[PDB]
């Protein structure tokens, strides 16, 4: 299910917080 190619997208959305 979960797509390894999406993981960095999340790492980005995180930074836009931190």
């Amino acid at each position: 299910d979960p797509n390894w190619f999406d993981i960095t997208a999340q790492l980005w959305e995180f930074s836009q917080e931190l």
Partner: antibody
Amino acid sequence: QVQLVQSGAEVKRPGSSVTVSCKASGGSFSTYALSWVRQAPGRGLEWMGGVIPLLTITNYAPRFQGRITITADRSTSTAYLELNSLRPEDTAVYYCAREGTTGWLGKPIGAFAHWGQGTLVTVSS
Amino acid sequence: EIVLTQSPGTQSLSPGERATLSCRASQSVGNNKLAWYQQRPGQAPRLLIYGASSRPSGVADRFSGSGSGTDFTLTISRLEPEDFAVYYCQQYGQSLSTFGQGTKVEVKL
């Protein structure tokens, strides 16, 4: 925005191991996905696996599982592909490939915007 | 594992003409995560189209991506000489990414 340089051409015998280096310069290294894509001569591209250096999150194509190891070194912005149990069928040019970004520290796009120059590995006896 | 079958194997056209390249995926591509790449002899491949129809900065206007699910098309509107290369499609909609066998676009005559 990013330059990747790979280690040089290498000559191996069957049953041995190869490790190819890909060094990254420009932008930031840790949070963009880097894949290895090889190409046998005269034939087409094949995705082998990849890594996210932050936490070394790996992902391997099933047909290489058990023979392949991908590692990333954050202080040198360098990723490594290790392929063992080599056979002549493994003769090919090996490429490192890194995620693109939108708009260098921009949103990753998944697809491969940045390539290394390639590394021919020949396996023969 | 998703198979990406590319059609036709060998496009033979003249400079200034139009190239329509097909990519057929054996299952639906997750989130339309499909890319197109150009490769000239001895060179590393180059990203043309990402997310099915998006275009990276620096990529030429004449290139266009389209499609959804299982059929995708890469179009070139006005073939420049610098376009006679090999073209690959790629899916990254699931962890296991695959490439197509590629289409040779060669100068006819």
